[PDB]
């Protein structure tokens, strides 16, 4: 009954979001972690901010309590940049986050979840990298903000149930209920 999962967040840090809008994404990610991580759960969290390049903020192995994770999320600094490349972002997760040396328990059939939040269409199609992760057992969650349509969010997400869309970062929290039920299913 205890929840076991490794969740890696991939956050668009480009100019698709303003700096203060990015802080609303961090707050949303913190709220997700705070409610999904119950007392006694074995949940690890890593986070990547990406523009044209990915930036490792922390790995699954780094922090071991919910409070350390939440404090780590609320220390990420918006870095900006142009041309958010979600394909390079997902490939970086493939190489550097869903591996044992980064703390991933993918080898032990522990649920692996990639949570993508993007505010604009990727300058490089990420459909094949997302499919390669899905076929390896990684569940890819995709949350498109403002300039993301149904087809782009469908290319990133593993399936329709893990594809979400909102009109702005302030609306992100109306997905909280739906995201957690889907996250709940993704650990069942």
């Amino acid at each position: 009954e205890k929840k076991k999962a490794d969740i890696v967040f991939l956050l668009d840090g480009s100019i698709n979001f303003r700096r203060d809008s990015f802080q609303e994404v961090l707050r949303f990610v913190s709220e997700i972690v705070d409610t999904v991580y119950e007392d006694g759960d074995s949940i690890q969290v890593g986070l990547v901010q990406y523009n044209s390049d990915p930036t490792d903020e922390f790995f699954l192995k780094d922090f071991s309590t919910k409070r350390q994770i939440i404090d780590a999320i609320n220390k990420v600094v918006y870095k900006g940049g142009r041309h958010a490349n979600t394909k390079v972002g997902l490939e970086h997760l493939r190489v550097n986050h869903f591996v044992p040396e980064a703390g991933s328990r993918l080898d032990q059939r522990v649920p692996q979840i990639a949570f993508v939040i993007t505010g604009g269409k990727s300058v490089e199609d990420a459909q094949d990298v997302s499919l390669a992760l899905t076929q390896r057992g990684v569940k890819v969650f995709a949350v498109g903000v403002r300039n993301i349509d149904s087809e782009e969010v469908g290319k990133i997400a593993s399936n329709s149930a893990t594809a979400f869309r909102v009109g702005n970062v302030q609306e992100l929290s109306e997905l909280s209920e739906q995201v957690l039920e889907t996250l709940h299913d993704a650990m069942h």
Side-chain angles (χ1 to χ4, degrees), residues 1-145 147-187:
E1 174 144 32
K2 144 172 121 167
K3 289 209 297 288
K4 276 181 293 300
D6 296 319
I7 311 165
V8 182
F9 286 93
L10 182 62
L11 302 187
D12 189 339
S14 80
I15 61 159
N16 290 343
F17 298 122
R18 321 183 306 100
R19 185 210 279 282
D20 310 285
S21 288
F22 184 80
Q23 311 294 126
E24 296 297 79
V25 177
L26 297 177
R27 192 222 59 242
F28 178 71
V29 172
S30 299
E31 296 175 294
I32 289 311
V33 174
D34 186 65
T35 73
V36 78
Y37 198 152
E38 281 160 291
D39 287 0
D41 282 349
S42 192
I43 294 164
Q44 302 184 127
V45 177
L47 197 144
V48 179
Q49 184 190 167
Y50 77 97
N51 44 24
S52 57
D53 296 299
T55 291
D56 298 319
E57 304 284 358
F58 54 88
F59 297 89
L60 297 156
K61 56 151 190 64
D62 281 335
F63 307 108
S64 267
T65 61
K66 146 205 278 192
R67 187 147 152 271
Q68 289 170 162
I69 296 173
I70 288 172
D71 177 63
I73 297 156
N74 294 134
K75 272 171 44 58
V76 179
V77 176
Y78 173 82
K79 292 169 187 51
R82 311 231 300 117
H83 312 109
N85 194 321
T86 313
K87 194 224 82 186
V88 176
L90 282 179
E91 207 82 279
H92 182 71
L93 270 53
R94 180 194 130 257
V95 174
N96 300 104
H97 283 256
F98 293 111
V99 285
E101 61 265 27
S104 172
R105 306 171 273 188
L106 76 163
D107 286 357
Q108 290 121 55
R109 263 262 199 250
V110 173
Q112 306 291 296
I113 294 167
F115 206 106
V116 183
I117 307 185
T118 167
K121 185 179 177 179
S122 176
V123 295
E124 194 153 307
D125 200 331
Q127 222 193 331
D128 321 287
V129 177
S130 170
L131 180 65
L133 283 165
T134 303
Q135 295 184 329
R136 259 211 68 86
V138 179
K139 293 281 247 163
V140 187
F141 287 56
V143 178
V145 190
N147 285 131
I148 289 250
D149 72 9
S150 56
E151 301 335 297
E152 174 75 7
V153 82
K155 292 191 188 170
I156 303 168
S158 291
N159 57 70
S160 317
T162 69
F164 314 88
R165 279 181 68 192
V166 281
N168 45 90
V169 300
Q170 299 73 31
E171 284 191 2
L172 274 166
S173 86
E174 75 166 7
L175 312 165
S176 296
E177 262 271 286
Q178 197 176 133
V179 162
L180 291 157
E181 171 176 354
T182 313
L183 285 171
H184 168 269
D185 298 348
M187 318 200 191

